[PDB]
Amino acid sequence: PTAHWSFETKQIHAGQQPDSALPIYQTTSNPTTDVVEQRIAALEGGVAALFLSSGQAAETFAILNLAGAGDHIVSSPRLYGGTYNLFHYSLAKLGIEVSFVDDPDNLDSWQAAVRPNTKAFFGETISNPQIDLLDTPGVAEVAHRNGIPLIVDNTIATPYLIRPFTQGADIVVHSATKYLGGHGAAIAGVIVDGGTFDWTQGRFPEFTTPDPSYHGVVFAELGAPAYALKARVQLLRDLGSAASPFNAFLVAQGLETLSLRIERHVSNAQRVAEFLADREDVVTVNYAGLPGSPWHERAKKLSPKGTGAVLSFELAGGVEAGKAFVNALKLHSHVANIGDVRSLVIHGLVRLAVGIEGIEDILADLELGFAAARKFS
Amino acid sequence: PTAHWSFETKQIHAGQNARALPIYQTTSTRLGNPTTDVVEQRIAALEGGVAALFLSSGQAAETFAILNLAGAGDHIVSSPRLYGGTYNLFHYSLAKLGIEVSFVDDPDNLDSWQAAVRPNTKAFFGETISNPQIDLLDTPGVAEVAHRNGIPLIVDNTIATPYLIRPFTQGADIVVHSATKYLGGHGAAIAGVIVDGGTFDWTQGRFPEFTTPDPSYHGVVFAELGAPAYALKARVQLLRDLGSAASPFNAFLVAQGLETLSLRIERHVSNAQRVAEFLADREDVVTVNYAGLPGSPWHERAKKLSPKGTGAVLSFELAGGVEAGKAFVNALKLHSHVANIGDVRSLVIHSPGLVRLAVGIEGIEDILADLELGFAAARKF
Amino acid sequence: HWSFETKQIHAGQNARALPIYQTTSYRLGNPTTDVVEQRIAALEGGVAALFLSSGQAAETFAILNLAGAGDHIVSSPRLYGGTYNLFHYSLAKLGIEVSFVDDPDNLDSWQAAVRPNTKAFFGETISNPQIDLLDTPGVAEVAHRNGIPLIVDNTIATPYLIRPFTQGADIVVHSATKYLGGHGAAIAGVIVDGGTFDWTQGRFPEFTTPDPSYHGVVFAELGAPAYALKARVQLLRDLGSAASPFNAFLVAQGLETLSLRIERHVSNAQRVAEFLADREDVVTVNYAGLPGSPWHERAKKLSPKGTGAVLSFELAKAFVNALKLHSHVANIGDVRSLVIHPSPGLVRLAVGIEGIEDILADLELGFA
Amino acid sequence: PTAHWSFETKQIHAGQQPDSATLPIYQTTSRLGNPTTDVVEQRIAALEGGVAALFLSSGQAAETFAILNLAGAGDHIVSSPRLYGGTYNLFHYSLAKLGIEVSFVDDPDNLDSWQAAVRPNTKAFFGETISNPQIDLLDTPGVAEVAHRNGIPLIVDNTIATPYLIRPFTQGADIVVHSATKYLGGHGAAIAGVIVDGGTFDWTQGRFPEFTTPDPSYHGVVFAELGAPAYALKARVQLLRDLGSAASPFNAFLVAQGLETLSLRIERHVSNAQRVAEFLADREDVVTVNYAGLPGSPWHERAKKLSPKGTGAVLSFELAGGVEAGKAFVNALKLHSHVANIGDVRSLVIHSPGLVRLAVGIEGIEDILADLELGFAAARKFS
């Protein structure tokens, strides 16, 4: 019907009421949330999505939907600190062991980490501060040949740059707090089900055994959105990481301009990267969009429109130069979250999430940081 | 400082040129929020606790209350008189996480609680008033068994509210509410809250997570933080990792409900009492469950633990089983079939002739007139 | 059929909370705001209501729906300061002359102020800081025998205490900012049409002439809610004092406990009034609920359940500075008690729903 | 300090707390102002380069307050006849009842007509920078020059252009009005109006005694003595105080959020609208297209001078088959909304004989064009 719509059309209209041509159902007796779920699914080309209280809860649910006590996960070591803390501390206490591969670019390393109780592979499509790209097709190929699904976090790339289901991923997670909502005004997470994975190959008896908690349903018999439905009826029901309808409303409102924002974030980031790479007082820049990045060729293949809005770089003067540089910035925020419209310092490496301000104001602000770092030759 | 205020004053001012609460609708600590902080402090003040943690839902509050103490290989002892959502959490989702929840046969038998104690038991759990039984938990008695084994007692105080029972004064260590219900009061904001009594010694030996430097959080030893150790641990570990965060807008809405809590519970309770009496006096009603009725086995317990009343939920049995009850609920014109317990709106839900009501704050005579419609309809069966 | 209590939750409404139609799509009605209007109309017993950006806009619309340049209004001098400013300054600029009777208790003064171009009488059912009660039946019969409608502001009394349509008023105005919303969280006004006035008697050709701005409609031929409908399709359309659906939602939330809050505000205020009257260091107390008030007997007739929650008293700057619980900034009609020291020893209170003993404790700190 | 910032920086940062580096909703009635609303006022004023702004309940209220701040009973306004129907209704019906006479010039491009309508009681000139359905541009410098030589201020409504395309204070306007409901908020989610004071007009020349006489309603203040923002301050302390057209803080929050992407949205609205215009102009079954961005428009040269980045997102056109063709065309559209407001991100039909009026959204251009083809297939039965 509307599958052929462009991205731009979808970010406004996908999931809308069939007679629209968005009321906040702030009730505990959800239609507001369902629209935002349908819209995000449509942007990723997934079959269904589940909107939740935060990105942390989305990562939690993505894992817990498959794994419990005595189960195992294989993860890239290149992780957001909040995901690492979840995997390494709180999940370990629930009897889920998360192993990290030595080098996520080494496909043999993923294979070697596979164990009989492994329930998923996990990685981030673009990680920070490295600004690598995951080899989603190659990692997915290893997972699938073992009967294991691949979960990826696509927060930094967004669906505008990468639709990982087209690359082999089975489950996509976003911190909607960040780019999807875009305005720093609503904490939210979302899990998107690709509907690409066969749940009946052996490792997932919870998908093939009648669930006495829910009318004896066998989730795999629900077809493509099995995983998403199971997460809603078991995890959301029991663990209760529900999204406020008001937050759903706000994220839907931010989604209406997603492509426009990402286009500007990305062109600003590319320019900041290039600016930095050309300076004598910068030792190195990490940004896949630069010709010299080790992941630039991969970016041309997997993410041709750009490599997100986050970058990092090292100053010649080391740790003290880095501190002096960041503490001198006036326009860059020190309190904003990645994925806001605002430029910010992410809390000798300096880490920036580049905003949609005027590029000349952004570069003038960075010159303040360079002036401050100058005392630390 | 202001611990001496009345409940009425606290519900408006506790935690606070007094005025309405602004909404910090912002994701820029990310582990606190000025709007939510105030609601936490207020709910803590109303229960007489030392700290509280406000969350996405009541379900998440139950979840966090258990997970803050128990992980894979651990054990919990619960009353079998449980809200369906808590039952499912305990029996399905926690089991998956390696946590065994054992239910006592009869929660009024204190020896049964003792007998269920195991070396890996990490808490006792019960609801101060359960539904549809409308019993009261023997909070003092159950607490005493828990404490003599070095175990804390967690209670859900949702139906009673802090206006009727402050369980910390009866031996509970941790209190959970679905703030979705009575606390917010208007059916407008899904939310949960955990309140820490600060009355339990975490160093007796079952809780090495409280006595061991935490590598995730600067080597802090939670027990050394004193009275609010449990609340702080839950925030810095569980909310941090698991992310059952509340929207600041939902906290604002709950605050707005809190401002009238005691007024609303007073009328919910006076109405519910009258509905119960009304029902107990009818010949086409087989039995009524409600602790405020003299005939209830928990009536005397209510006089000691909850003298102002026994909440606003009740149930009762009709002569004709399922079929009389189906047409009873189908005839009501004022009672909602979709509103949540703890809304201002009366609601109805269908022993096979068992009808369950959460009595609202509508005019009593309108409520009773509406029920007569139900009786008439059921009398075709 | 339904009691006030059931109406404040269900009037206008598988009952559940009101959704928020936060949207500018199609435009001069909104489903969230519609419910709050019907609800408030049900509580006052009117035929229709119109919910607006503020009480000031409600006063403004209530006059401008009837009067334009070259017209006249007769008003009580016992007015809220914002209404006085509107009447005396802004409306004068628009060529509307507002005249104030010397004594609003003097029914013959009302009669004497009538002019050929007079388009309404106005008064407040309970005024502040005097805490009189308007003689609504008596002012209304003076108005009506001259072919003129009575507009009253019922903000302080609320519909829980007085339903002025029962006493001869034709239009009622509230600052829903105050007691209706109840929580200091939503600026709003409302006009309620009693549907009790014949608009065709001669002073109102705007009601008996086809409106070329609106399909030649003759507003009087719409029957009972002619006034409310006219205000919506002309004034709201053109002047644009619209309420946010979010503010309507917040006021609906407050309405759900209105009777409960007013009951408590009024027993607290009644007790605070009585407290204050018993004290040798207090010269006088204004509160119609006190047996000594000149308006006490009128209160028994027109407001038997009590006389609002606002009061004032004269002392023999220090008193307020000592208060720790009373807010200096909360608006009248918030849950929070409010104090003001503007007689040169006059103190003004809006008594909240805090515990009465804490309120009186806080006042005792005042007396020091 | 932050004047040199680009438009893009300002739409995010102008008016922010000075320590925001190291937007709460003050939904409190504790009272002619609010920090949430003040941020949105300062940000809009910065985008226009004005000295102050006043944010209000709706665009209708902003038009109302912009006139009533200057005119009461027995006063006069000169207006362009090219007006939004909501403004015309206000001017012609409600303000007329308040004793305010609004005259319309026959042709707003004839500067001598503006002069000829000036009366001793004239308090303002009014026009829209781009009107709809004509999609002309007001001759803001020439109209301003006439106003000013008579000691009269020029009020313009800059809603359709937005501050991204035109800053009318740079072209002689003194007061700017927006329906913030539309493009400023951008998401069809908050009704609002705003009045922006240019700080560019001398109020002491003779026609404005309300600005040079002590006001007993407000401490004997002489508004002109407050300097540049006299007009905005007077509107706040008199009209907002008395007439009460206040904005909900929640609405201000929502508009502030939409402002964060203003330039980006307007860029895409405008390049979409230019493509739709060219597409229509090239069709045999379209008789004419009104859009200033087209070379054929009588206002295209004026656009090149006054609005070089483009001419808004609204257009109109006439179909060959007249009125039935136009109705068939609009009724067949599936993606265009029939209920959204101008200035939403959504494409919509806005409600000569066969005239179709569109506000072009930021959807994918190919999808917008395919939807219009539904309309052309429907119109085919009316040649």
PDB file of C-alpha atoms in Angstrom, chain D residues 111-200:
ATOM      1  CA  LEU D 111       1.982  52.926  -3.250  1.00  0.00           C
ATOM      2  CA  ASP D 112      -0.152  55.988  -3.995  1.00  0.00           C
ATOM      3  CA  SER D 113      -3.239  54.000  -2.936  1.00  0.00           C
ATOM      4  CA  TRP D 114      -1.698  53.507   0.530  1.00  0.00           C
ATOM      5  CA  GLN D 115      -1.072  57.252   0.814  1.00  0.00           C
ATOM      6  CA  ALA D 116      -4.609  58.069  -0.364  1.00  0.00           C
ATOM      7  CA  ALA D 117      -6.142  55.913   2.406  1.00  0.00           C
ATOM      8  CA  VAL D 118      -4.276  57.700   5.229  1.00  0.00           C
ATOM      9  CA  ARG D 119      -6.598  59.506   7.671  1.00  0.00           C
ATOM     10  CA  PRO D 120      -5.886  61.614  10.777  1.00  0.00           C
ATOM     11  CA  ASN D 121      -6.941  58.684  12.992  1.00  0.00           C
ATOM     12  CA  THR D 122      -4.845  56.085  11.151  1.00  0.00           C
ATOM     13  CA  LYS D 123      -2.772  54.083  13.689  1.00  0.00           C
ATOM     14  CA  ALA D 124      -1.092  51.428  11.532  1.00  0.00           C
ATOM     15  CA  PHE D 125      -0.478  49.954   8.100  1.00  0.00           C
ATOM     16  CA  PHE D 126      -0.928  46.142   7.752  1.00  0.00           C
ATOM     17  CA  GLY D 127       0.033  43.539   5.209  1.00  0.00           C
ATOM     18  CA  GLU D 128       1.230  39.999   4.755  1.00  0.00           C
ATOM     19  CA  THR D 129       4.780  39.479   3.452  1.00  0.00           C
ATOM     20  CA  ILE D 130       3.545  36.614   1.179  1.00  0.00           C
ATOM     21  CA  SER D 131      -0.240  36.207   0.808  1.00  0.00           C
ATOM     22  CA  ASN D 132      -2.225  33.104  -0.173  1.00  0.00           C
ATOM     23  CA  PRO D 133      -3.659  32.074  -2.674  1.00  0.00           C
ATOM     24  CA  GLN D 134      -2.030  34.786  -4.793  1.00  0.00           C
ATOM     25  CA  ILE D 135       1.512  34.106  -3.568  1.00  0.00           C
ATOM     26  CA  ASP D 136       2.479  37.736  -4.138  1.00  0.00           C
ATOM     27  CA  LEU D 137       5.110  39.505  -2.071  1.00  0.00           C
ATOM     28  CA  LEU D 138       4.204  42.727  -0.259  1.00  0.00           C
ATOM     29  CA  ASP D 139       6.410  45.653  -1.287  1.00  0.00           C
ATOM     30  CA  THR D 140       7.567  45.977   2.286  1.00  0.00           C
ATOM     31  CA  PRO D 141      10.208  48.766   1.713  1.00  0.00           C
ATOM     32  CA  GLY D 142       7.791  50.895  -0.378  1.00  0.00           C
ATOM     33  CA  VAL D 143       4.828  50.380   1.904  1.00  0.00           C
ATOM     34  CA  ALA D 144       7.025  51.064   4.956  1.00  0.00           C
ATOM     35  CA  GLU D 145       8.267  54.287   3.379  1.00  0.00           C
ATOM     36  CA  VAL D 146       4.682  55.546   2.918  1.00  0.00           C
ATOM     37  CA  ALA D 147       3.730  54.611   6.480  1.00  0.00           C
ATOM     38  CA  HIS D 148       6.786  56.272   7.963  1.00  0.00           C
ATOM     39  CA  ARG D 149       6.548  59.582   6.151  1.00  0.00           C
ATOM     40  CA  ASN D 150       3.073  59.882   7.714  1.00  0.00           C
ATOM     41  CA  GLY D 151       4.293  58.964  11.226  1.00  0.00           C
ATOM     42  CA  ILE D 152       2.618  55.516  10.984  1.00  0.00           C
ATOM     43  CA  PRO D 153       4.099  52.082  11.864  1.00  0.00           C
ATOM     44  CA  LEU D 154       3.956  49.053   9.523  1.00  0.00           C
ATOM     45  CA  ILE D 155       2.744  45.750  10.968  1.00  0.00           C
ATOM     46  CA  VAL D 156       3.346  42.672   8.778  1.00  0.00           C
ATOM     47  CA  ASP D 157       2.347  39.065   9.138  1.00  0.00           C
ATOM     48  CA  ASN D 158       5.385  37.013   8.193  1.00  0.00           C
ATOM     49  CA  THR D 159       3.830  33.597   8.851  1.00  0.00           C
ATOM     50  CA  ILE D 160       4.122  32.029   5.421  1.00  0.00           C
ATOM     51  CA  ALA D 161       7.665  33.308   4.674  1.00  0.00           C
ATOM     52  CA  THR D 162       9.084  32.731   8.193  1.00  0.00           C
ATOM     53  CA  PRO D 163      12.149  34.514   9.505  1.00  0.00           C
ATOM     54  CA  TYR D 164      14.279  31.987   7.506  1.00  0.00           C
ATOM     55  CA  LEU D 165      13.183  33.555   4.216  1.00  0.00           C
ATOM     56  CA  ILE D 166      12.411  37.161   5.179  1.00  0.00           C
ATOM     57  CA  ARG D 167      13.375  39.404   8.092  1.00  0.00           C
ATOM     58  CA  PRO D 168      10.920  42.264   7.491  1.00  0.00           C
ATOM     59  CA  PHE D 169      12.538  44.612  10.078  1.00  0.00           C
ATOM     60  CA  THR D 170      15.422  44.828   7.543  1.00  0.00           C
ATOM     61  CA  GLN D 171      12.944  46.024   4.882  1.00  0.00           C
ATOM     62  CA  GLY D 172      11.123  48.683   6.950  1.00  0.00           C
ATOM     63  CA  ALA D 173       8.473  46.814   8.934  1.00  0.00           C
ATOM     64  CA  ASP D 174       8.166  47.829  12.636  1.00  0.00           C
ATOM     65  CA  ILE D 175       6.067  44.994  14.019  1.00  0.00           C
ATOM     66  CA  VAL D 176       5.963  41.344  12.912  1.00  0.00           C
ATOM     67  CA  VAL D 177       3.212  38.820  13.630  1.00  0.00           C
ATOM     68  CA  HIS D 178       3.311  35.076  13.295  1.00  0.00           C
ATOM     69  CA  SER D 179       0.749  32.352  13.693  1.00  0.00           C
ATOM     70  CA  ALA D 180       3.282  30.142  15.556  1.00  0.00           C
ATOM     71  CA  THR D 181       0.650  27.459  15.167  1.00  0.00           C
ATOM     72  CA  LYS D 182       1.962  27.023  11.668  1.00  0.00           C
ATOM     73  CA  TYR D 183       5.651  26.867  10.521  1.00  0.00           C
ATOM     74  CA  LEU D 184       7.339  28.067  13.759  1.00  0.00           C
ATOM     75  CA  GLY D 185       6.025  25.125  15.777  1.00  0.00           C
ATOM     76  CA  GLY D 186       5.825  23.076  12.616  1.00  0.00           C
ATOM     77  CA  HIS D 187       4.111  19.897  13.840  1.00  0.00           C
ATOM     78  CA  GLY D 188       0.453  20.802  14.108  1.00  0.00           C
ATOM     79  CA  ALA D 189       0.661  20.319  17.841  1.00  0.00           C
ATOM     80  CA  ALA D 190       0.440  23.754  19.498  1.00  0.00           C
ATOM     81  CA  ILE D 191      -1.792  26.722  18.750  1.00  0.00           C
ATOM     82  CA  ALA D 192       0.121  29.929  19.388  1.00  0.00           C
ATOM     83  CA  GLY D 193       0.747  33.457  18.214  1.00  0.00           C
ATOM     84  CA  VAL D 194       3.635  35.795  18.621  1.00  0.00           C
ATOM     85  CA  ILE D 195       4.191  39.536  18.162  1.00  0.00           C
ATOM     86  CA  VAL D 196       7.732  40.737  17.546  1.00  0.00           C
ATOM     87  CA  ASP D 197       8.791  44.403  18.207  1.00  0.00           C
ATOM     88  CA  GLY D 198      11.447  45.689  15.785  1.00  0.00           C
ATOM     89  CA  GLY D 199      12.379  48.552  18.140  1.00  0.00           C
ATOM     90  CA  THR D 200      12.642  50.656  14.923  1.00  0.00           C
TER      91      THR D 200
END
